[PDB]
């Protein structure tokens, strides 16, 4: 058997050659990627089981379809999926369901996408025990379809200025929902337009004229039998989008729509029947769990671009040798491999974040602040660097990347949306910047010892100079220490600019605005430091020497590519020299060439079947050209030879001349 | 009147407020953008004329349509367009045709997009006088539909290894075109799949077994009356794409398809009837003229993002004042305004490039191809930097609209998909940057060997001597020259540094081409800096040509924002050798944030100065009048998925699924 477990007989030999050079077992790397040998094996067992159920396969290639056709296809697969789920899956294994959906439903959306991502989690986090019994069970059994309705046409970021109102009628004992203007329409909740018949709905709660602020409510939207909008409801789709068009993102409006008092979600907060209010002592779920989604989507795109790079030949290096694999050019390795490093790094960073999400929550029955800040920065950097890498992966396929035969353009449209959902990236970076400024005030005021673990480096003292290419035994610790220095220096520098403008008389919020770009520079460096450290932490946890060396090579590529990308900050104070920067450059180009024989195996280790990956250029077997010709020939515009546009128009136009 | 000529009564006052602060006449800035007052006025006159012809309007909003519906809509407008063109336009000055097409046909494509972009230019540049009479006239009159077929399924970059063959039969006096394998299929030529009935076709020419390399041929593809494929022709669409889906990009295959000898394009090469060859003494057209296309598409996206930023309120700065325009936050100004600077810079750089394209070509009747090399290298780098930085900016503009930007009501996502395609067409960006790098390495060998005086004007700075230190924030001068000199220093230093690494590996024994590959990433760093320097210098040159003081000050503010944003983005190269200090870099930072706030009251006018009507711009968020929310609610309500209340997906599937539980 081969160390690379994806080789099959008959595969394109140009691609097999790249798998044959693997130094590690791809099953063992999968276990690392997916958090356990068991987890990885279940992925493969699910994939092998779905191969025997053709009902759950793409009835035709998805890029052939109109929006209407895709929505029908998705619901077709979903009904079959919900019926047969237990034959394939442990429904309670949130991990198995995610993979099952990726193979069967894919990334473009489905009618119950929000049902899982937010509707159920909102019920877990905010409904009382009695209410969970009424609604959460019906949701889990898929008796109803639900979503989470927070954003409105005129507000998504702010929320203290939402316009939908829930006014408590003390007699009758109902909440009266009302949408006073068009801008108060709920707007963007996924699966709200056509699919959901219930929603959790954020609205400003009014009692005795007093505004208690945003609160969440269970709201029936459509009749459970005919699916018509209940009286007082205005509801529909918000139209087509950049991507993710299978989800029916919706608008929702209320004309004095009454719900029971008990529709207010009361695990935290109560409104008694007379009107009395009792105060208690997320959205954070989405940010914590979306990081794998981005890593995975980045890995989709790199699997395709790197596989295609092994089969695509183009140009000569040596004039007496044949055309080389484009994978041969340093320019091509340089535009792919740093992103393979990033995809592993994002995965490992996401595992630590999910652990921290579970660690708070557990402790919540003084660390939510640290989690909110980490997640704020990480969601913004990961999403932005993923987009950069996906698009580099598309363009690395040449002309054909622009075709939907690559599928990378759809991977891009869906992944990039995470720059805006779950918190605008600019806003989430400034959210982290507030935490970093608080931390900088601790340092400046002598309370350095009160810094939490994630931000203690801001209190540490820097050595004069950075010991890259100095201390014997080139270690990743001198790179970590260099990242720490530049992130601390920019954090304290940006903070002090802010403090200095207030000291000089400017209002807090105007000084904040004037320093906000600088402050986002700090957030970004602090977060990019976190990704490095998480990557290095995993490399050191591993005992299997072949796996450890493979990921260690990747880590070395990571720290040199990233440090070079931020070299400006290392040079400003002379922390780094010209000579150390040329060392980082030569190291970057060295580790490109080191990684190459493993590049395809490092991506095969994610173990995406063709039915998941949906790419012709990225076919597991490497037989691109023949299947690309078929895919073109079978596409909808080639049904007829001479188009209606040519008969109706165009031919008459030519005749007239 | 108002200095800003786009204000109309009834407009959203949040947006009007931003136009009222203009310091210059937007008609006068249009003249600067489009190269003359007359040209700019014609744009507006064309727009006013098209308002009286509703037949040429989007029959319904384009994002509502399937691919099939859009293609039908495009040909509908095209037929009307070709019949009524003379009523609106001077067909020969075009130019006006480019703008007419932008309003009527838009960016997503049309059946005759490549008819203009490449088919006709190929006939101008490569057909003899006799052949132009046969084919170019029919093309201009739109008697035929044509395209340019170079790329194949297996080769786009490496033309030397194309697989389609044209073998000369000496008897019969024909060329025999043949497609020996699937990978030899022509693949990607726009409008080839369904619309064109003729094409210019690049193929390796064989005579008596000898391969003379790529040559271009006029090739009839479909019957002029039935539009069926002529015998021996395999032809169709290559399928849907990231964007630009109205163009039917095609595949084309030949089974020993014979064309006359005289179908070889013979303005420069000849093949006589017996077989005799005779050697002569582009694609460069596309690269030269596509730069405005990118500038314009960048300006579309910024018009939308900045207009929407004036009407979108969100959050408080001062806690006792109402929610602010998002166009107030420094992060928002920082994510838009540098790209406004870039869009002007690309336009001005594109005008100088088109002048150089005309200046060679003009000189190519005499000697005199000793300037094609300078043009090819400039165009190689510029097409790569402009296209890549445009994409960065378009996407920043989309995300500056928040959630709604992701909707097609913004239209920026389509602007993005179409514009970014230019990172790959007309030369892969990585390949075109290395094409420039060859020219820079040749130039570095002149310097190293003492022939500095032989450097052409565009690359003479590589021979100049640098001062010790860069005089930004040191020495007053009337603005910008110390920034230019700093850009020159870092671009020269990286060029000579990357070149010497290449020379050093050969000196140590590596083969030329392996040393090249090993230095290629570094070499593209040089290309990029040299090109980004050119854009600065072109921008500064235009600022100094202008006499109208208000216009000059407005563009001067933009130029200052440009040089500080770009220099900061490349600061690594300025700091490495101590050319710049920490303190000068903090000056560049403070300058960047200053010029953001300086530019703001002009931001919306600088974009209105491009003078894109709503029918051109196609954005709900970007409406000239600023009435976003009401027209966004309508746009959603009228979209195709809201025709019915309960979807078929709910009746067929989904409702049964719920019942079963
Ligand atoms: C929207 C779009 C429209 C198009 N329209 C037309 C048309 O109308 N007519 C026509 O003929 N073609 C058309 N094309 C095709 C286009 O010309 C080619 O796709 C383009 O030239 C890229 O070449 P390629 O496809 O062979 O990419 P490839 O060369 O196959 O792959 C490029 C990758 O390999 C690398 N690479 C390749 N060669 C080298 C080298 N020497 N050195 C270093 N790296 C290298 C690059 O780094 C890049 O990452 C279109 C393409 C697109 C996307
Ligand atoms: C694919 C997609 C899916 C979505 N799914 C859901 C869903 O499922 N459920 C749901 O409830 N909502 C959903 N939304 C809406 C989403 O939550 C909001 O769009 C997102 O949170 C951003 O808020 P916004 O639209 O108001 O951005 P805006 O505030 O309108 O941003 C516009 C510009 O203003 C900037 N800006 C805003 N505030 C500040 C500030 N204080 N300081 C500096 N700059 C600022 C922003 O950085 C941005 O550049 C979705 C949106 C998208 C695109
Ligand atoms: N003109 C371009 N078109 C497409 N992609 C590009 C272009 N220039 C750079 N890239 C990509 O951006 C990534 C960064 O490469 P590189 O660091 O050499 O360029 P840069 O960061 O833009 O310049 P520098 O790092 O020298 O400031 C690479 O993946 C490269 O492929
Ligand atoms: N996390 C992010 N998500 C989306 N866009 C971003 C993000 N960070 C930066 N940008 C965009 O990149 C552009 C450049 O700004 P900036 O220089 O602050 O970012 P950067 O270059 O990545 O950071 P630095 O300059 O410190 O390396 C800005 O216009 C901004 O909109
Ligand atoms: Mg870089
Ligand atoms: Mg920057």
UniProtKB/Swiss-Prot annotation, chain A:
Q: What happens when you mutate residue 521 to E?
A: Loss of ATP binding
Instruction: Write out the residues that bind substrate.
Output: 287, 421-422
What does the induction field say? Induced by high temperatures (25 degrees Celsius).
Give the metabolic or biological pathway.
Lipid metabolism; peroxisomal fatty acid beta-oxidation
InterPro entries to which the protein is assigned, alphabetical:
ACOX_C_alpha1, Acyl-CoA_ox_N, Acyl-CoA_Oxase/DH_mid-dom_sf, Acyl-CoA_oxidase, Acyl-CoA_oxidase_C, AcylCo_DH-like_C, AcylCoA_DH/ox_N_sf, AcylCoA_DH/oxidase_NM_dom_sf
Tell me the GO BP annotations in alphabetical order.
ascaroside biosynthetic process; fatty acid beta-oxidation using acyl-CoA oxidase; pheromone biosynthetic process
Q: What is the effect of changing residue 384 to G?
A: Loss of ATP and FAD binding. Severe loss of catalytic activity toward ascaroside-CoA and fatty acyl-CoA substrates. Defects in the processing of ascarosides with 13-, 11-, 9-, and 7-carbon side chains. No defect in subcellular location
Q: How does it assemble?
A: Homodimer. Forms a heterodimer with acox-1.2. Forms a heterodimer with acox-1.3; the interaction may be important for the stability of acox-1.3.
Name used for this protein in its record: Acyl-coenzyme A oxidase acox-1.1
Q: What gene is behind this protein?
A: acox-1.1
């Amino acid at each position: 058997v081969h160390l690379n477990k994806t080789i099959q007989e008959g595969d394109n030999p140009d691609l097999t050659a790249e798998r044959l050079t693997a130094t590690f077992d791809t099953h063992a790397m999968a276990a690392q990627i997916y958090g356990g040998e068991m987890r990885a094996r279940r992925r493969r067992e699910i994939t092998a089981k779905l191969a025997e159920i053709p009902e759950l396969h793409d009835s035709m290639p998805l890029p052939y379809m109109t929006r209407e056709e895709k929505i029908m296809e998705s619901a077709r697969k979903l009904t079959v999926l919900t019926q047969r789920m237990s034959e394939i899956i442990d429904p309670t294994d949130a991990g198995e369901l995610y993979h099952l959906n990726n193979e069967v439903l894919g990334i473009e959306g489905n009618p119950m996408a929000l049902h899982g991502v937010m509707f159920i989690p909102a019920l877990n986090a905010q409904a009382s025990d009695e209410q969970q019994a009424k609604w959460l069970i019906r949701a889990l059994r898929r008796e109803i379809i639900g979503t989470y309705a927070q954003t409105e046409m005129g507000h998504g970021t702010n929320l203290q200025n939402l316009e939908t109102t829930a006014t408590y009628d003390i007699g009758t004992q109902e909440f009266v929902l009302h949408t006073p203007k068009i801008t108060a329409l709920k707007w963007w909740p996924g699966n709200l337009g056509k699919s959901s018949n219930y929603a959790v709905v954020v609205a400003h709660m009014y009692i005795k004229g007093k505004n208690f602020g945003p609160h969440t409510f269970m709201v029936p939207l459509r009749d459970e039998k005919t699916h018509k909008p209940l009286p007082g409801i205005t509801i529909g789709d918000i139209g087509p989008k950049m991507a993710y068009n299978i989800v029916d993102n919706g608008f929702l409006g209320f004309n004095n729509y009454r719900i029971p008092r008990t529709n207010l979600l009361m695990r935290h907060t109560k409104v008694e029947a007379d009107g009395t209010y009792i105060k208690p002592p997320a959205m954070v779920h989405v940010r914590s769990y979306m990081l794998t989604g981005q890593a995975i989507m980045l890995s989709y795109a790199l699997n395709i671009a790197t596989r295609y790079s092994a089969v695509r030949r183009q140009g000569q290096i040596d004039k007496n040798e044949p055309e080389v694999k484009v994978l041969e050019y340093q320019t091509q390795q340089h535009r792919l491999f740093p992103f393979i490093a990033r995809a592993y790094a994002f995965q490992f960073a996401g595992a630590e974040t999910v652990k921290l999400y579970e660690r708070v929550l557990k402790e919540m029955k003084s660390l939510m602040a640290d989690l909110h800040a980490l997640t704020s920065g990480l969601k913004s950097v990961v999403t932005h660097q993923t987009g950069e890498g996906i698009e580099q992966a598309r363009m690395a396929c040449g002309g054909h990347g622009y075709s939907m035969a690559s599928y990378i353009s759809e991977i891009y449209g869906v992944a990039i949306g995470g720059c805006t959902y779950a918190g605008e990236n600019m806003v989430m970076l400034l959210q982290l910047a507030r935490y970093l400024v608080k931390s900088a005030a601790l340092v400046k005021s002598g309370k350095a010892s009160q810094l939490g673990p994630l931000v203690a480096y801001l209190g540490a003292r820097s050595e004069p100079t950075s010991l890259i290419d100095r201390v014997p035994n080139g270690g990743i610790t001198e790179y970590i220490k260099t990242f720490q220095h530049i992130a601390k220096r920019q954090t304290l520098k940006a903070a002090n600019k802010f403090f200095g403008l207030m000291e000089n008389g400017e209002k807090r919020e105007i000084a904040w605005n004037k320093s906000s770009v600088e402050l986002n520079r700090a957030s970004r460096l602090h977060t990019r430091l976190f990704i490095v450290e998480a990557f290095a932490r995993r490399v050191n946890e591993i005992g299997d020497i072949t796996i450890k060396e493979a990921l260690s090579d990747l880590l070395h590529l990571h720290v040199n590519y990233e440090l070079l990308d931020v070299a400006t900050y290392a040079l400003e104070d002379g922390f780094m020299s010209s000579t150390q920067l040329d060392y980082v450059r030569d190291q970057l180009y060295f580790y490109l060439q080191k990684i190459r024989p493993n590049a395809v195996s490092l991506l095969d280790s994610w173990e995406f079947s063709d039915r998941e990956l949906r790419s012709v250029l990225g076919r597991r077997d490497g037989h691109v050209y023949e299947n690309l010709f078929k895919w073109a020939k079978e596409s909808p515009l080639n049904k007829t030879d001479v188009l209606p546009s040519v008969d109706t128009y165009l031919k008459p136009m030519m005749e007239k001349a």
